[PDB]
Structure 1
Amino acid sequence: VLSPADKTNVKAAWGKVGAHAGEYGAEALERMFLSFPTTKTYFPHFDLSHGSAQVKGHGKKVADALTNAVAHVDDMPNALSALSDLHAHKLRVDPVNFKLLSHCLLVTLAAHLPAEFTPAVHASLDKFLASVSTVLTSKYR
C-alpha cells in the first residue's frame, strides 16, 4: 500500500526518467534475459541479441504502461485492466517472472539515477513495482 510519501517518491523518480523511459525499459529486459535466462522461454519469437529492435520496441511498451501506472497510481486496477486481461488469458506468464523484471528495472534505474536512487526512493520504487505486479496478475485465476 503506497503511502503519500511513496507516491511522491515514485512521481519524482519516474519524472526524472522522463523521455528515456523507453531506453530504460529495453535495458531492463536485456538485463532480465541475461541474468534470468528462464525468462527467455516467453519470447521464442524474438531476436534477443544485443540491440534488437524487437526488444527495444517491447521495452518502449513496458515503459509506457509504467508511465501510465504512475499517472494513475490511485486507480491502477482500472488503468491496467486490459493488460491484466492480456497477461492472464493470453500471455499467461508465470507470476514468478514479475519479480525478476521488477528487480531488473530497479537495477536499471539505480544505474541511471545516481542521485535520485536514495534508500527511501529505492524502497518506494520496489513497493510500487510490486503493486504493479499484483495488479497485472490479479485475474490469473
Structure 2
Amino acid sequence: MLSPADKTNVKAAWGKVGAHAGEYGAEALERMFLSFPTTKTYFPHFDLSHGSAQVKGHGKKVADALTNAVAHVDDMPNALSALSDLHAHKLRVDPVAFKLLSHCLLVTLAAHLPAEFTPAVHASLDKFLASVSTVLTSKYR
C-alpha cells in the first residue's frame, strides 16, 4: 500500500512531468514494443512504426489516465473503475503485460527526470505503477 511519503513522492515527480506526459506515454509504449515484442500482440490494428500517430494518440490517453490516478491517488479504485471495467471485459490484456509497461514507464521517467529520480522516488513510482496495475486487473475474474 502507498504511504504518505509515497503519494508525495509520486505527485512531485509527476508534477515535473507537467506537459510532456503525452510524449512520455508514447515513448514508454515505443520502448515496450521494441524491448518486449510479445506486447505487440495487443495492437494488431495499429501502425507500430516509429512516430506513428496511433502510438502518440495512445500515449496521451495512457499518460492522461495516470495524471488522473495521481490526482485521485487516495481513491484509485473509484477513479479508475471504468478503465478497470474496460480491461477486464473487453481488452482482456494478460496481467503480466502490465509489469512490462510499468518498467518501460519507469525507464522513461529515469531518462527524462535525472535530479528527480532518486532511490526513494524510484521506489515510490514502482509501488504506484504496481497499485495502478492491480486496480486495472482487479475485476478480471
- Name the TM-score, length of structure 2 as normaliser: 1.00
- Output the CA distance in 2 between the equivalents of 1:52 and 1:119: 34
How far apart are residue 18 of structure 1 and its match? 0.6
**1:39 partner SS:** helix
CA deviation string 1:94-136 (max 9, x = no partner): 0000000000000000000011000000000000000000000
Instruction: Give, in angstroms, the shift of residue 92 of structure 1.
Output: 0.2
| Shift of residue 52, structure 1, vs aligned partner | 0.5
Aligned-pair CA distance for 1:77: 0.1
User: In structure 1, how many angstroms separate the alpha carbons of the residues matched to 2:22 and 2:51?
Assistant: 13
Q: In structure 2, the residue corresponding to 1:5 is in which secondary structure?
A: helix
* Alignment partners' CA distance in 2, 1:91 and 1:36: 19
**Structure 1 runs of 4+ off > 6 angstroms?**
none
Name the counterpart of 2:62. Answer: 62
- Give 1:33 deviation, angstroms: 0.2
Quote how far apart the aligned CAs of 1:56 are.
0.2
Give distance in 1, aligned partners of 2:114 and 2:122.
12
CA distance in 2 between counterparts of 1:64 and 1:29 reads: 14
Partner SS for 2:75: helix
**Structure 1 regions of 5+ residues with no counterpart?**
none
Q: How far apart are residue 90 of structure 1 and its match?
A: 0.2
Q: How many residues of Structure 1 are paired with residues of Structure 2 in the alignment? A: 141
The unaligned stretches of length 5 or more in structure 2 are none
Deviations 1:55-89 (A, max 9, x none): 00000000000000000001000100000000000
Give the whole-Å Cα distance in 1 for the aligned partners of 2:117 and 2:74: 23
Matching residue of 1:9: 9
What TM-score, normalized to structure 1? 1.00
Identity %: 99
